[PDB]
Design a binder for this molecule. Structure first.
Ligand SMILES: [Zn+2]
Lengths: 627, 49, 49, 100, 292, 79
């Protein structure tokens, strides 16, 4: 029924408007969309279009902007031509060939779709209804924005997320201890802000060695995508617009990069960000008489953006006073010197003593009570105090509300946050076993010669050599010498593994070559499927191995870590840990044990550690476990 | 619950599969044939065991 | 690729993959029937070869 | 381009790759049952071009240049047994892998 | 050194940062929340309609891949290699290789936007099987949307998000939506072929324009109540926040004037904006009763 | 009728019409949701239809009468 000149609408591409039949053939028809001026060619069969016509009495608009009131419509040669009375001047009888309608047709209300002959399938109506219903429902939950992050449910984290995510332009001091999850809290805050729409542009400042980590973490936990600005990218984006720093929404940059040119620092200062994220704030050193070079630039930045998050710790076990050095960035008015702040902390300390004594369940001196009476400025203290002090029936809630009142008067309760291992429950217990093994002679034969060469070398380095004998046996006898054929340790490990086929075991060793050789021995001598995990791999192969180790009953049984960089996935089902050999300084030993000592263990960790007698291991096991 | 669960349960050959299979074939004749089929008694319908 | 105007031409007979043209501009349901102009193959099933 | 024989096959679980050495050929003595892998082969295919952001990503995650099919050899189903002998033929001009 | 350290504690900070019993109750609440099965039965259907193949693997892992019949050329999150998703929390904690799909993941939000924003499913014509009922009766389904307009940083989402009203009219404008549930009603309907439905609507062409303005009489009053109720909640909770914040302000030097000024301004703006709500008609379905 | 189908043949008349009648009845039990008459004894629907035919309960006209009754009565009770 297609004939030249008519007006048709594309079924699916309604974002074009009306179209006109320019030419026809036996199988192909051509339409022009003047509103965009675009040529389209449709095959006659299957008719992916629809005809448009206006019923008498309605209104039509011509291309010159003057409406009409249609009264009759004629058809000739298949072509439909309208007649109506104008509405601007109300002249009657004016006719329009339909090729003089608008260029933009709208069907904003669906009944025009239905009347024009547009029918979809039934199911899509069901989806539309259910979709809008669920959206309406799920927007409103009080705790929305805290279910999409890939982390277990840890209350001392959700509390901070709830507290700081429901502020306006917050500015806090996240100074949690290591192993507690400061960066997880920062991610939670960013997620909570970005989901409610409360902010859009975010700056993040981290030094060069850490940048990549942040990228991957974000992309794999909080579903946020970032762009990286280095010297290169900023250079070619200098052309692209006036401020290159306006092309994107979330930005990663290092402070040393911003300090390269001051014009660049101004470019950062002038881009109107919402949130600023600062990393390792404890490195940023300031003195009242010596304001450092790095301090001034961040001080300049902190004045044009409302919200700041600071990531820091309190190293070298120095008191909270040092936090003052940065706190001036948050609220420069309330802080005006350090001496008064230290004085107030000194004043708080006896009150801390009193509350510690009270919560311990022991009686309070009446002389001390008129320091808690001073610290809170009221006069209804005594009825509360006598009840809470003598262990009454409701002394617990009395004490709780009293300490709540003192909390409301804390110096830095709402501006500073701390988590310590001591006060929060959930950590599992660490149980030890030890086994000693007899020394085979070949090691003595090798050591009697090796004891000479490391003469003009550190006792640190001399011990670092002798500590683990295998790597010196290799040097005398040639590399890949068959050292795994008379050790007691390998035999003990195989014996232990093969009698407990239902335990997942994490074996950690010294370096990569040792890990690979242990894996080969196990695989070809006892058929124990083992998965290696060392620091030369890519980031995908690590994921493949860690995925295999997690299969519950058909997958691997032993994970051979080689001096792990503590990138630290959650190994929630591994409970036993075998320490093949021992390192020097205890911090990385805590690293090792904390690869499994995280909140959420079902059972308590058990550590094994077999050692050869009369060697470095003999000294070190004693020194660690007993000293 | 789903088809893939059934695929794996059948391939691993767990005893419930043997019980179900013994249930299904009951009262379900099959056709046995031998070629060449010269006359109409060439294919017949038996009942499995 | 099928030569144009040859014994396998996609202009004459049909597409090679479902709801895709040859050059690769339009794709998969929004352009149903839209005879693409630059390569000239209708966008329908391949059970038309 | 050219095929390759390798152990890094895209989209295989770690389970099936215990029984291949570095060069990607079965051990001698390992006993196979229908469905396993005998030789790891990958066939390169078209290289479509890209945007800088994924260049950064694929340089951090670090895995590939030429997203590539696999067409390895596998035991046709219903067969089993115990491999007893592996032979490798090479041209004159191809670098000899370790196992040959 | 251990004794000297343990004497140097400031336990008020620790008892403050832990949250208390309320934080534990909150965590448990989310724990009970994470066992929803509505999301699975919704997401599976949505992905089957948009046209994403779901191959099931078995260990609570499903792989998604775009198919040949997809509703849109290119989608935000997918790629022709397919991705893996899991709705459980523990499995997703052990496998940092796989996505974690909840009500806040970009796939759900982008699919929701694609369905809602466009015009799919708006115009449907159907048929109903009831020989117990007179021939030629009319039933019309109306999908009313209640809306407010304001920039996002006012977060109207928490008071009056786009809210639906389902309306079921007869020839004399009497409701049946309040009586019959959607699923039981719709499970008895069926469809019609395209061409016959194309004309069948025309014979009742005027009747539709007769129907709507009947329901327009009541929908507005419904709208009023929602805004009225909404305003009350907008009045209530924020004021308590107001009530709380300055209550702390007069006691400690850690409260800035900017926060309270901003919240007062936001309250006035949100009240004024929510006093400007509107409503539109988004979808409609025709129901014609036959004796077949 | 587990083994031999001799009686039903005399009970209806052809080796062929028996097939159609029994198939229709077993269909009614298969999906239509009706209930059998002779006790199950842990047997498939097909042999149940054959036993019903042999005993003299499900002929052809009986099927017609029964379906007519159910149709009319449900239609009348619709209002
Ligand atoms: Zn094309």
């Amino acid at each position: 029924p297609f004939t030249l000149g008519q007006r048709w609408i594309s079924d699916t591409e309604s974002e074009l408007g009306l179209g006109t039949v320019v030419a026809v053939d036996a199988r192909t028809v051509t339409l022009l969309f003047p509103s965009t001026g675009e040529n389209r060619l449709y095959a006659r069969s299957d008719s992916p279009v629809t005809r448009v016509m206006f019923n008498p009495g309605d209104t039509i608009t011509s291309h010159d902007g003057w409406q009409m009131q249609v009264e009759e419509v004629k058809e000739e040669n298949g072509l439909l031509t309208y007649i109506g009375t104008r509405l601007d001047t109300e002249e009657s009888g004016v006719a329009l060939r339909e090729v003089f309608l608008d260029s933009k047709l709208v069907f904003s209300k669906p009944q025009d779709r239905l009347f024009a002959g547009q029918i979809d399938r039934m199911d899509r109506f069901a989806l539309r209804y259910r979709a809008r219903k669920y959206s309406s429902e799920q927007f409103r939950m009080p705790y929305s924005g805290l279910r999409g992050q890939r982390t277990s449910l840890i209350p001392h984290q959700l509390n901070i997320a709830h507290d700081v995510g429901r502020r306006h332009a917050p500015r806090v001091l996240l100074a949690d201890e290591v192993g507690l999850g400061k960066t997880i809290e920062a991610g939670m805050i960013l997620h909570q802000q970005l989901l409610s729409g409360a902010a859009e542009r975010v700056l993040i400042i981290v030094p060069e060695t850490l940048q990549h980590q942040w990228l991957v973490e974000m992309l794999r936990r909080f579903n946020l995508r970032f762009a990286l600005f280095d010297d290169e990218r900023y250079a070619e984006a200098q052309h692209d617009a006036y401020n290159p720093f306006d092309t994107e929404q979330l930005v990663i940059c290092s402070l040393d990069f911003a300090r390269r040119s001051k014009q660049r620092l101004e470019h950062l200062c002038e881009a109107e960000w919402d949130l600023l994220v600062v990393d390792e704030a404890h490195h940023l050193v300031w003195s009242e008489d010596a304001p450092s070079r790095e301090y001034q630039a961040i001080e300049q930045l902190a004045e044009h953006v409302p919200g700041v998050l600071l990531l820091t710790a309190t190293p070298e076990q120095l008191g909270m006073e040092s936090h003052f050095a940065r706190l001036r960035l948050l609220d420069p008015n309330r802080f005006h010197d350090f001496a008064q702040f230290v004085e107030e902390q000194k004043n708080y300390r006896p009150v801390a003593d009193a509350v510690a004594m009270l919560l311990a369940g022991n009686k309070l001196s009446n002389d001390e009570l008129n320091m808690l009476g001073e610290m809170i400025g009221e006069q209804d203290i005594e009825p509360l105090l006598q009840a809470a002090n003598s262990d009454s029936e409701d002394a617990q809630s009395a004490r709780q509300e009293l300490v709540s009142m003192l909390m409301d008067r804390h110096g830095t309760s709402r501006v500073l946050f701390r988590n310590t291992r001591n006060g929060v429950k959930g950590f599992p217990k660490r149980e030890l076993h030890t086994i000693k093994l007899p020394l085979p002679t070949q090691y003595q034969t090798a050591i009697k010669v090796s004891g000479i060469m490391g003469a003009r070398k550190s006792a640190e380095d001399r011990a670092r050599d002798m500590l683990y004998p295998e790597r010196i046996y290799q040097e005398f006898e040639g590399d890949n010498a068959t050292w795994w054929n008379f050790d007691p340790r390998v035999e003990w490990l195989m014996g232990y593994l093969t009698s407990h086929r239902s335990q997942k075991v994490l074996v950690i060793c010294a370096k990569a070559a040792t890990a690979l050789q242990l894996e080969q021995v196990l695989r070809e001598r006892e058929g124990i499927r083992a998965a290696v995990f060392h620091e030369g791999m890519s980031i995908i192969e690590r994921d493949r191995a860690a995925a295999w180790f997690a299969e519950e009953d058909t997958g691997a049984q032993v994970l051979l870590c080689s001096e792990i960089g503590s990138e630290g996935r959650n190994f929630q089902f591994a409970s036993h840990m075998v320490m093949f050999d021992l390192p020097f300084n205890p911090d990385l030993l805590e690293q090792r044990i904390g690869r499994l000592d995280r909140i959420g263990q079902a059972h308590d960790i058990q550590i094994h550690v077999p050692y050869l007698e009369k060697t470095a291991q003999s000294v070190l096991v004693r020194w660690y476990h007993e000293g | 619950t789903t088809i893939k669960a059934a695929k794996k349960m059948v391939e691993r050959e767990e005893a419930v599969v043997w019980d179900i299979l013994d249930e299904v074939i009951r009262e379900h004749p099959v056709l046995l044939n031998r070629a060449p089929t010269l006359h109409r008694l060439g294919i017949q319908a038996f009942e499995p065991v | 690729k099928p030569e144009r105007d040859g014994l396998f031409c996609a202009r004459i007979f049909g597409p090679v993959k479902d709801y895709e043209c040859l050059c690769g501009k339009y794709k998969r349901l929004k352009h149903r029937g839209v005879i693409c102009e630059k390569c000239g193959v209708e966008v329908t099933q391949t059970k038309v070869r | 381009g050219p095929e390759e024989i390798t152990a890094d096959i895209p989209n295989v679980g770690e389970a099936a790759l215990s029984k291949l050495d570095e060069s990607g050929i079965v051990y001698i003595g390992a006993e196979v049952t229908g469905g396993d892998i005998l030789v790891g082969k990958v066939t390169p295919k078209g290289e479509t071009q890209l945007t800088p952001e994924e260049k950064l990503l694929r340089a951090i995650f670090g895995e590939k240049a030429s997203d590539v099919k696999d067409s390895s050899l596998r035991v046709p189903n219903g067969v089993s047994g115990t491999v007893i002998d592996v032979q490798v033929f090479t041209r004159d001009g191809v670098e000899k892998d370790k196992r040959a | 050194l251990k004794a000297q350290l343990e004497q140097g504690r400031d336990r008020l900070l620790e008892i403050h940062s832990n949250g208390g019993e309320k934080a534990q109750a909150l965590a448990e609440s989310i724990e009970e929340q994470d066992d929803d099965t509505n999301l699975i039965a919704f997401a599976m259907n949505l992905f089957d309609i948009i046209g994403i193949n779901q191959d099931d693997r078995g260990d609570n892992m499903i792989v998604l891949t775009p198919s040949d019949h997809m509703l849109v050329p290119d989608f935000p999150g997918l790629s022709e290699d397919g991705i893996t998703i899991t709705f459980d929390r523990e499995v997703a904690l052990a496998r940092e290789d796989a996505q974690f799909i909840t009500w806040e993941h970009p796939l759900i939000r982008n699919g929701l936007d694609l369905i809602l924003s466009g015009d799919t499913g708006s115009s449907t014509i159907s048929l109903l099987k009831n020989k117990a009922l007179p021939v030629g009766t009319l039933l019309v389904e109306l999908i009313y949307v209640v809306e407010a307009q304001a920039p996002k940083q006012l977060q109207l989402n928490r008071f009056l998000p786009p809210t639906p009203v389902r309306m079921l009219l007869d020839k004399n404008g009497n409701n049946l939506a309040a009586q019959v549930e959607f699923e039981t009603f719709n499970r008895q309907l069926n469809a019609v072929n395209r061409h016959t439905g194309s004309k069948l609507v025309n014979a009742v062409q005027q009747d539709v324009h007769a129907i709507l303005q009947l329901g327009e009489a009541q929908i507005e009053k419904s709208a009023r109540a929602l805004i009225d109720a909404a305003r009350n909640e907008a009045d209530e909770k924020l004021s308590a926040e107001l009530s709380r914040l300055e209550a702390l302000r007069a006691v400690n030097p850690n409260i800035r004037d900017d926060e309270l000024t901003a919240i007062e301004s936001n309250r006035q703006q949100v009240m004024e904006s929510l006093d400007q709500a509107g409503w539109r008609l988004d979808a409609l379905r025709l129901i014609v009763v036959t004796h077949q | 009728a587990r083994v031999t189908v001799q009686d039903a043949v005399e009970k209806i008349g052809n080796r062929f019409d028996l097939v159609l009648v029994a198939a229709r009845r077993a269909r009614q039990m298969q999906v239509g949701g009706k209930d059998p008459l002779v006790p199950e004894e842990n047997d498939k629907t097909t042999v149940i239809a054959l036993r019903e035919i042999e005993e003299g309960l499900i002929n052809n006209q009986i099927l017609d009468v029964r379906e007519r009754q159910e149709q009319q009565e449900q239609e009348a009770a619709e209002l």
